Amino acid sequence: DIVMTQTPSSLAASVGDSVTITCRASESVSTVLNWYQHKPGKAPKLLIYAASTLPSGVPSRFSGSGSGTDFTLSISSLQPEDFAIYYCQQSYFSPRTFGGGTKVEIK
Amino acid sequence: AVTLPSHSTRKLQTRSQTWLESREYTKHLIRVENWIFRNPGFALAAAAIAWLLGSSTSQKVIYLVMILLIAPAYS
Amino acid sequence: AVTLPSHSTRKLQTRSQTWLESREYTKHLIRVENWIFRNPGFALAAAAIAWLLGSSTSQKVIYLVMILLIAPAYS
Amino acid sequence: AVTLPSHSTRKLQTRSQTWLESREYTKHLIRVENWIFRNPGFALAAAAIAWLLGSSTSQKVIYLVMILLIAPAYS
Amino acid sequence: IRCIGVSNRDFVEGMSGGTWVDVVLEHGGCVTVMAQDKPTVDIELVTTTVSNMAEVRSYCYEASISDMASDSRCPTQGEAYLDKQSDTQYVCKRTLVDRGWGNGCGLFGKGSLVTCAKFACSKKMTGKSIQPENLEYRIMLSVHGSQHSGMIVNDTGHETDENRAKVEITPNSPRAEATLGGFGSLGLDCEPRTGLDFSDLYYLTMNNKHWLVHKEWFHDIPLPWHAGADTGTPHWNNKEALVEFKDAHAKRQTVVVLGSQEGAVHTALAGALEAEMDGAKGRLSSGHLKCRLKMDKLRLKGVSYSLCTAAFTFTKIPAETLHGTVTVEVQYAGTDGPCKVPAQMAVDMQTLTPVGRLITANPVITESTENSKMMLELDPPFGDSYIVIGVGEKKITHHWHRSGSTIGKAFEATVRGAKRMAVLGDTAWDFGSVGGALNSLGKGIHQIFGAAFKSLFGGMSWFSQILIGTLLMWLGLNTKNGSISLMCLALGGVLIFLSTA
Amino acid sequence: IRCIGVSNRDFVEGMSGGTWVDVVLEHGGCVTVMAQDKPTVDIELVTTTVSNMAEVRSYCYEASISDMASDSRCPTQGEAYLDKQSDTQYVCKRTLVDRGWGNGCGLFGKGSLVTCAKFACSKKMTGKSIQPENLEYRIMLSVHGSQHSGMIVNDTGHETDENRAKVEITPNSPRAEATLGGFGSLGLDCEPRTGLDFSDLYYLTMNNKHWLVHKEWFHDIPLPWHAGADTGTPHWNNKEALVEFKDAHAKRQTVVVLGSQEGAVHTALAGALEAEMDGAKGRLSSGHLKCRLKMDKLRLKGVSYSLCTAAFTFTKIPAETLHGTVTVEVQYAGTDGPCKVPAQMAVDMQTLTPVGRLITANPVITESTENSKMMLELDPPFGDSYIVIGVGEKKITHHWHRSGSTIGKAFEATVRGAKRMAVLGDTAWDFGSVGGALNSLGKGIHQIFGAAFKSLFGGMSWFSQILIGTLLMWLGLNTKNGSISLMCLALGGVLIFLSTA
Amino acid sequence: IRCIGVSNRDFVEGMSGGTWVDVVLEHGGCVTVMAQDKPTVDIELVTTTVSNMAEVRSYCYEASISDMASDSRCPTQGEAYLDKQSDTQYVCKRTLVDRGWGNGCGLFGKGSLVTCAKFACSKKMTGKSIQPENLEYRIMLSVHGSQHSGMIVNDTGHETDENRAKVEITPNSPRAEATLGGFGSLGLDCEPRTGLDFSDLYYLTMNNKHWLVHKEWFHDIPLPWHAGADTGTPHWNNKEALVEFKDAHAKRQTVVVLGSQEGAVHTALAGALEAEMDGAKGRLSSGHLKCRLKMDKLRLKGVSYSLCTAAFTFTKIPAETLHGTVTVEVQYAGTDGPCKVPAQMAVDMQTLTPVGRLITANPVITESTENSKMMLELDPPFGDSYIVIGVGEKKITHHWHRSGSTIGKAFEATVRGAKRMAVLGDTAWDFGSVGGALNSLGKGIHQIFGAAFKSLFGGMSWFSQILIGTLLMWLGLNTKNGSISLMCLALGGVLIFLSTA
Amino acid sequence: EVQLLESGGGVVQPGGSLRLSCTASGFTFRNFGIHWVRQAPGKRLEWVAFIRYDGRNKYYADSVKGRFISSRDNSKNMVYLDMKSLRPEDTAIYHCAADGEETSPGSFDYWGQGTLVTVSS
């Protein structure tokens, strides 16, 4: 039932920037929260699980941290394959609810 | 579901016949009478244990009664 | 490491519950129960040391309890 | 996850060094000495207790060291 | 009227100030009042409509085991695992079974074995809860006077009639006075909280029969159950009590199920009451209600009436009524309208000096046609006395002989007071006047002893009470201490509970 | 209101002069006051915002050993040397290893051997410090009166409202009185220094969970650490506790690392409290605060009001509240404006003599529309008593039966006073009036015994206290000296600390 | 050769009949034999390949709680129900929480509350089982004689070579004699059942490190687990040990999870051994093996050889070897082919009377080229003695001074016999000849005392043994009964177990 | 990788029925869990259903409880979603998202492309 609000969904950066989008929680979610890299016409893949760590396959430029009240996704260098839809998603409180969706636009 | 709590422990003190008051008078006695009639040989051992305890001619009979009552329903 | 001190030395006594207060009553008791249950000869050995150590019968049982307390945790 | 049994109960005695042998000689001695260093009034408490427990002169020191070994481990 | 064939009618009186006699109203026992100059009404608790009930742990008794499996391991491969171990719709048990070359193993020893079985319960029982605040008592009043015996248990129509009128006692409204319009209005403030010790009395429903079990007996049942806040396919919280695992070897043990526990929980209900279900509300018939009657507005109806001056032929042969009262029914063969019957008793009809009390106070005729039946109730003295009805010539006479004596009446009133004390206890002293030393101090000492008794013994049967009474009887004759009368107090306090039915 | 479902509500009273009743406010336990002619407010400590914290020794628990080497010498060439011995980012240990022709040496004997290993810690814990001077308490007041039960825990909006108002207690300002504008102003001077014995309570942060460890337990941890005044690539002060050197021969011994010490320091926290982090400030929920309430400006709001002269229909079914209080909620079906509810108790409604104390002192209606809900709180006597609300006709009545006795109330108040003494100790005597022999001298002797106890035993668990209580119990029955009651004093002083949860 | 730098080499001898000297072979301690007229071979247990292991209860230590919920009821609606209560992938706990009007209930009391949480374990540990029948010992032999010091630990290639040859000891074949073709064939029948007390030793695998835990310690772990006969998404049998339910009110309590129990089970392993994993087989390095050497086919190789008649220049500077043996390595500067080295000892070189025993019995040269290195091993007497090698002119001499005395040798052999007894116990008497009063009767009485000791104390640490030794020491000086030497027997039987490392 | 295919979606009249077939490949299907999540256009991402590996434990959301019947096929490697009596508020892209069980805990792991399910007049 809880909501996952975040940073304003429109950002336009260049290739190879250091973007940090924050995800603001409603209650104490406590480091069980995920992010997704979604492109239109494409199934999303998992990016950060358990608010800190990463699975295999994805590059280590994606770095997620924070808990309690606010969470964050940090990418070191924006590759041109990263201009996608990002949204955070909790898994502490059921039902599992996603964020809002943040578009990463070309500058 | 081997044992069940008897509701007769907590019967409802009121002016109405309860659910088994036609049978509650001679249930706990009919079980003792049937069990004594089954193996009557236990009465000798119950008197023998009673004769070894108490030793007042009026406490031996009461330990006989208690031993004879805790034997059919094993308490 | 190995020798982390328990915070239950200095428990913050207050109105709300502490961190591990649910599993604190049966925390030491489970360990003593398991260590006596899986080493039953030490019950006999500690009974022997208590009966050779104590003067009265009321001090031998204290020695027996204290040795069968010491030997689970090894102090 | 709270009362993990120590494997030092059943030590696999052999020629090769075990998992933690160098940090085993001062595993229990630190838990005793640190708790005595940080609760020194319990030495007075255990002394006044053992003076009331012990019959002989060399009995109360066994009571005192038994209490000063139980209470740093609470077991 | 309405208190005539109950065999448990109590008479109350004694309002020379205050006019607030207080009564307790059991279900089987109606209560007749008596006043100085007010009509004797007959009050009787009829139902108790426990309404709007919740649900608590609904047990099961008809268990059907199906779709079972098994799995094992050799004596060193650990225990077995099964897919039907990982849902709580299935019951499982691990058990060590001796295995060897004949079972295809590699060693000889305690090989483990797990078996599973789907728990399907067919006929379950449901234990509803009873809040103390939605009780709905139903007291029906009935005055004495202008009504024949055809209107004694006749309940059909009492909004148009006045001689009987019913009231409801909810805990949101124990302020309910009935309008006997013409008789006045019987003020009546009951006390529906202290009923049959509610909020400990669950409402056990099984096989479309209903009970009032104690909360203790209902929580102490070892059977499969689930919390009542539920719908279809429940999750049975403890299935180990209705399945039995006989261990047969060769990597599958047999899972037998205990059968329908219907009769076992029937014979375990050795002290619960019975109730019915009226749909959403469970109407029961038991318990009591310490009410209190304010007769500040009970006036006699026909006290400004003349005397009837005609035949008064008998009808329906007057008969005794199990306490000594006599219910004469007469018909008035005249046309004197709303008039008044000149009835009395007489030890001799040379003087006609009234001796016995007339229970139907100011008995009137309310009709005006040719024939008008009316039912009295008189209480003769012990001995022979005539029943005189009519003013002069064409009076009638039925000679009576009330059997017994005043000593027998006092003994019967003593034994029924002891029976009412044995049923109620605390609320037995709430049967009379204002009290200074018999209805307040007596309630205090009886409350103290009833608490320190029903917490002391509190859980004994009919038969164990006899055993403990014999034990304290033998203790009450062989002791040289001061606790002879204390053991005899616990003799009387138990055996009087046993002397009643 | 706000002190209704806490199961730990204490009642205070007794201001016939001074009007400075003093209370201690734990987190789980709300406190309701009671005055002569002032409204009963309900005070409740909600949070404790420890703000602006420093850092102390931040331990490590996840050690990752990599980039290891080794070096040796023949049994006469002295010990070994390594380049990775000369930085403190690497851990090293020298060890004598038996060497010979098979290891290419020249003699046979204790050849030395040094090995090194880079210490890389991954997940570290951080122990912040708590100054006593930047505590930030938050007490929320709540008056009793013109508010329904929908505004009991409703905290959203209290600057516009008046019936509840919150205050902050910083040590720079324990002079904070709340403006209940219309009710007056509750003067309130707390004492935030003597909270939960601060400046010994570090704020341990690990894995984004938070604690309040004692300073003793935090400094007595054998783990790698560095001082908190730090940034990236720290210098671990004691790495010997998380690496273990198994000595394998042939000029390289194995450096194994102990794993994640997470669960070990979790189960070592057997008595610490838990807290949350609100970003920069660590909001916790525990402890107490010896405040003192000056009721010099608490006036009744509607004491110049008339009495309500309309329906007063019930709503929301009045219920008992775990101490005997009864929270009646009524709605007023009229339009009498800012008027006042005529509520009372009655043992009988023939006289209506009020017997029980009304907790919601001067209960008013502040609305003026058709329906206006309001929530009372009454305290009936032990026994049966009616709840009367309304002046005349269309009064309402809900009969009550408050269970228990005065002896049971005195015993429960005794056991909760012993529980409050067992939790606080020194500050338990700060719960009442000015004191001459019970709040000052008693605090003196209890302060002396609490210091000479908590320095004497001071460090025992829940279970070792039971053991030492059994020991002093056996000492308290077999001694022929005067120290029977002294050992029994140390029996009671321990076992009452054990009887509480 | 291969028994030269082990610091634990034992010498055995004494075959004047039978030729079946029996030895126990620990991992750290190599064993050198000595015969009448047979070559001294050096036997050394290298590995122990536990192969083809099953699985037992695989515990968990990294628990990740996610997807939690909660449900409650008012204080009379029974307990709560949840869909996540009816799968065993979720952990649940019911708990009474105080509720009232502020939580939207109807009464005030212990409202129930159920919460659930999905148990997801990330890093689990796996405890494999070890059958006693698939042990695979690996004994490497090495004869003394025609080989330099470059072939002491050189294991690469021994099928082509003859001076060292390895054998496997499976329980399906303890009949394995090695073919030292030319030296004969060392008959060798071991006993691989009575190894390190197997079938009680599980093989704990965690974080790709491996152990040999006792079966007792492995079953007494309170952690979540599932039976090893499993695959993905296991069913955790006991999840209550890694989740902790802090009870916060308002119909949802907090489910915190204890963290990674890695370090706790690491420091709980205070006595287990370590092992490695070679894929499917777990190769360890520990334990012992009571073998028995039949020297029925050990013949001297070059006993029909002439004496070398050339230079014999020294090389590689001869050195003492920690037991007094001297490992002279010479190179033969001639071309005499398969010839024999004329080595001896001498207290003086005027007479050349051999005094010390030559360990390398019949030391030969097997080469025929110019330079041919060979390594001897001599045992000088206590004092000064020369090492003489060569027949006549151009003999060599290295004067030796073996330090110590015969009393020191006897004391060191006594303390190492006590150390071997303290490690093995029962199998310590299996180190010599046929036995009539020292290897059979002694094994009997030591077997009886070892069983009645290791079942009596059996479970004490290194430190509790010191405490109980001090206790029986104080008991062993203050008693006037016959049990002074019995308490001193339990003094020695404990403190000798403590004097060893 | 994870070929999570979806089928069954199309145009739906309100109150009608729909069976969404999800075929999985690229792993062991029996020992994982499987969800159902939706993307309502104009709004955020939601979650509608969940099945356990056993094949009987079925969880849903509050809006679709008593409306969706969701099953799975272990043998023929299919996931079924028997949606019945829909409403025009359920127009979304029902992705077939795989759960992270015991590997990526508490997380929707790799998703499916999702079929287009539109219900209008």
Residue numbers in the entry:
A (entry chain L): 1 to 106, 106A
B (entry chain B), C (entry chain F), D (entry chain D): 1 to 75
E (entry chain A), F (entry chain E), G (entry chain C): 1 to 501
H (entry chain H): 1 to 121
Describing publication, verbatim:
Zika virus (ZIKV) is a mosquito-borne human pathogen and a member of the Flaviviridae family, closely related to dengue virus (DENV), yellow fever virus (YFV), West Nile virus (WNV), Japanese encephalitis virus (JEV) and tick-borne encephalitis virus (TBEV). The E protein mediates the assembly of virus, virus entry and fusion with host membrane, contains putative receptor binding sites and is a major target for nAbs. The icosahedral mature ZIKV consists of 180 copies each of E and M proteins arranged in 60 asymmetric units. The ZIKV E ectodomain, which is the most exposed antigenic protein to nAbs, consists of three subdomains: a central ß-barrel domain I (E-DI), the dimerization domain II (E-DII), and an Ig-like binding domain III (E-DIII).
Potently neutralizing ZIKV Abs either bind to epitopes on E protein domains (E-DI, E-DII and E-DIII) or to quaternary epitopes constituting more than one domain from neighboring E proteins within a dimer or in the interface between the two dimers. The E dimer dependent antibodies can be classified into two classes. The first class binds the interface between two E monomers within a dimer, for example the nAbs C8 (DENV cross-reactive), A11 (DENV cross-reactive), and Z20 (weakly cross-reactive against DENV). The second class, where the nAb epitope is spread across two E protein dimers, is represented in ZIKV-117, C10 and Z23. These nAbs block the conformational changes required for virus membrane fusion and inhibit domain reorganization as well as the formation of fusogenic trimers. The evolution of ZIKV-induced B cell responses in three DENV infected donors has been reported. Five months post-ZIKV infection, the donors developed ZIKV-specific antibodies in addition to the already existing DENV cross-reactive antibodies. However, about 60% of the ZIKV-specific nAbs targeted epitopes overlapping the nAb, ADI-30056 with IC50 values between 1.0 and 10 ng/mL. Therefore, we determined the structure of ZIKV in complex with ADI-30056 antigen-binding fragment (Fab) (ADI-Fab30056) using cryo-Electron Microscopy (cryo-EM) at a resolution of 4.0 Å. Both structural and functional analyses were used to identify binding determinants, binding mechanism and the evolution of ZIKV specific neutralization by ADI-30056 and related nAbs.
